[model samples]
Target: HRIRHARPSDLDALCALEARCWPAPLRASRAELLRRVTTEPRGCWVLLHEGAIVGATYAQRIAGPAALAGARHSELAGLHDPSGAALQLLGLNVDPAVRNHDFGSLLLEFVLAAARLRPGIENVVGVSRCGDYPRQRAKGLGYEDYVHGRGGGPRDPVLGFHLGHGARIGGIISGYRPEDVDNDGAGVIVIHALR
Candidate 1:
């Protein structure tokens, strides 16, 4: 297993893997990803196994409260402020075939574990699954409340795993990805205090 900062050469592989990992609406476009890899290499990492891309976690620093909950993917364009205090996890992509392995866990651990190393980064924030659209069990992560949707549903496994890692459910945001049919664009926001 190995980890490295994403580079321009990884574009083709990145797009292929994302297409296999997520649905159309959830996949990031080539242009969008290119910008991230080129501008925010420090916060973007590619996990490799036997020289192949297995997983990746793309993140950027958020300036203030404006980029908090309810922020959409489109808004992330050109907004990655390195000197900011908050880390906004834009996306996590793993090869669909390796979802059963430690790929996802390893990637998240890599970023969250180094929270202290990132200067001025007080906390890591991102969207999660809401109870209304429960995708797994919510036994982990100190869930606060609904930041987006309302009502009940199955607990999302991804969110549950995040909970186990000491993350907190900040809230949900309806239409978080307005154009995405998945989850009706509604999701729960999560936070992990590093400082």
Candidate 2:
């Protein structure tokens, strides 16, 4: 496996990854993905296995915390501010068939490292599915509970993975995907300080 900066030509591969990894409401459109690969090549990357795309992380520098609050996937496509101080993680997708191999975590570290290379960035913030899916056993609520000191909160294997990676739940992002149901609609805002 290897990591490479995303290129405009990688749009087809990126789109395929999106279609296979997430629902329509959550996936970025091809045009949006194109903009991402072309706009900030430095922060966009893809994980290749056998010379094919298997995982990817897309991000852009953002202005501040509020820019991330209540934001949705669609809103992020047009928000990459190259001069901003906060690096907002816009998308992280790892093929379900190839998950559990720490692919997502490796891509995350790549974006964090990219942020550190640029001056002025002090924090990295983004949304994470508190639970993979639930009829209310969602990790978002559990993570929120944990953030509020409300017992042990819910146990989410995915959120547990992220939490294990040094990310903390700062708050919940409700209606994160207005078009989706399940825990997929609600997200937890994961925050990490660069310093």
Candidate 3:
């Protein structure tokens, strides 16, 4: 029901969530999670309801907080903005017990609400590498495909979360929308098609 910056106490719980959501290679390392959750809590956010973590969202500063680092595919998407970091919309982890349910959407809604509050943050985007399971889902969820002169949908093989000027970044995430029945948003495949 709410979203906020992750806390040190959320360390184990977050780590465990990653493991449960992603495979050994796909999930973030414990040390890495710690660094972000502690050193850069602004970039790392989580969703919880009644003290229970339902879903999560995280991003890394690109140049500070303009775009996302991985948006290199679309010059506009990854355009150089010297002011702040380009957030790399990372994961949307949801418990398996809640799979095929609306929990993930709730998590995203929480993340959206939180993203709007963080200053210096610009466009929030994410990637679904060639082989990742969440690719199709990412696209279908209204995430745009920033294709760079390519005939393909998303040239970089990644999905984008473009911010509409007046559109509250947090509102976008906080406003939940049920997926169209099939979403590979998890990106479990981890292949070139996902890159």
Candidate 4:
């Protein structure tokens, strides 16, 4: 049960794990992941158990303005509102072998807990695959509609979701905790009262 920044040598193996964890097309190409791991000056992370890659995730502070998928830099940043810079969970991968071992929860717990302690990274977000996968299999990661307010205001065609912030977000996953897979603390409270 360990997670650490991925190094250059870990790329090929990491890519395989990424492919297995995510759906087609969404799986990062070697080149795309290569760029991701190298883009950040500090690098990304991969989780390991029993000396094998079991889970992995990457976080980066949005600096200046940049376009992400179908999102404008400002619009996405507006969701998280990290005062200094928006820290986003760019990509999260877990080994299919240990998918049920709470590996994803461990990864999310590691990052969100770390974010609570870091500056320039107020927001914590992830975009799961649309439709069934987002709501079902991608438990710890985050659903687009659940995290980001899914409406015409943001106007994102890709339907990306903003995660783990603000007063209203835990409705979908009730009984969430910061240490749990989803961390829907606010959402849980909001929903419990409704029932």
Candidate 5:
């Protein structure tokens, strides 16, 4: 397995991987994915195993940590800043067949490591899908309680993954992904200070 910067030519395979990773309502269109790799190639990457793409991650530099609060995923289309102080991770997908091998964490660490080398980048930020929220909310758990978790840990696996990597919960955003029925369109903002 290996990782490398994403290229325009990789979009087809990337899109295919995306389709498998997310439902239509939560998936990124080809144009959207294109904009990310084209606008900031440095923040986009693909993981390969046996010369085939198995995982991918995309990010873009943003103004700062403050810009992340309550930020909607839609806003990211116009928020890419080449010299921004924070790198906002937009997406991370791993092929279902290759999951459970830590590919997600590997891709995440690759992005974080790259961000640390970029000048002017002070932190890494991301909006994690509260995949468990809809079910938990139906059980009467508030958003705050779910995010803070029981026994001092995150209730959502995706959120927990970010926190496990040293990120802290910044806040929650509504309509972060309007079609994310599983999360009820909610997202958890996670921040990791780099310096």
Candidate 6:
């Protein structure tokens, strides 16, 4: 497998992979993905397996941690600032059939490494989906408890993925993504400070 910066020509495959990874309402559209690759070319990337796109990640520079408060997935691209102090990971998608290959982590590390090279980048931030919220909520768990795993079990898989990669929970937000019914429209902010 190979990873490289995404190109405009990759939009079709990227969009398809995004659709497969995320439900219709939560997926980034072609137009939105196009702006990401064009606006911050260096921050967008794709993973190839056998010469086909199987995973992709997109990021944009943002002013600071405060920029993510109450921000929705659809609104992140517009927050892109070339001179911002932090890099916000806008999206990550890996082919469902190609799970367990660590492609997602590789794509994430690529972006983090690139952020380190930027002069003023202080950290990398992202809003992780609390995919298990609804299930836990049905079992009498609240948003905060589910995110912090106060019940004393494993955390949400998506959130756990970020934590496994060195990110800490920065905060939580409501209405982060209205279409994210599984999460009750909530998001967990994860921050990976650069050294």
Q: Write model 2 residue lDDT over 1-195, tens digit each, in one string.
A: 568888888888889999999877767788888887777788888889888899988777888666777777556666677778788777888999999887888888777787788899988877777434453343344435543335454546656666766777777787777665655366777776778
Instruction: Give the alpha-carbon lDDT of every model.
Output: 0.71, 0.74, 0.47, 0.49, 0.84, 0.85
Which TM-score value belongs to model 2? 0.84
1-195: candidate 1 lDDT, tens digit per residue: 668888889999989988998778777899988888887778889999888898888888877434665566577565577788777787887887878786788888888866569788888877665323333224232233323212254345667767767787776677667765445566666788776
Better of 1 and 4 by TM-score: 1
Preferred candidate (lDDT higher): 4 or 5 = 5
- How far is 177's C-alpha from truth in model 2 (Å)? 1.2
Candidate with more favorable, higher lDDT: 1 or 3? 1
- Candidate 6 lDDT tens digits, 1-195: 567889999989988898899888878878988988998888888888998899888888888888887787666667777888999888888999998887888887888888888889999998888766777877888888888889677888889888888899998888888788888887889999889
Model 3 stretches with alpha carbons more than 4 Å out: 49-51, 64-85, 130-195
Error of 3 at 20 (Å): 0.8
Q: Count the backbone clashes (under 3 Å) in each candidate.
A: 13, 1, 34, 3, 0, 0
- Residue 61 of model 1 has an lDDT of 81
Q: Name model 4 segments beyond 4 Å from true.
A: 41-43, 63-84, 131-195
Cα error of candidate 3 at position 132, Å: 6.7
Q: Using TM-score as the measure, what is the rank order of every candidate, best first?
A: 6, 5, 2, 1, 4, 3
TM-score of 4: 0.58
Q: What TM-score should be assigned to candidate 3? A: 0.54
Q: Model 6: runs farther than 4 Å from truth?
A: none
Candidate 5: pairs in clash: none
**Alpha-carbon error at 188 in model 2, in Å?**
1.7
Give the local distance difference test score of model 5: 0.84
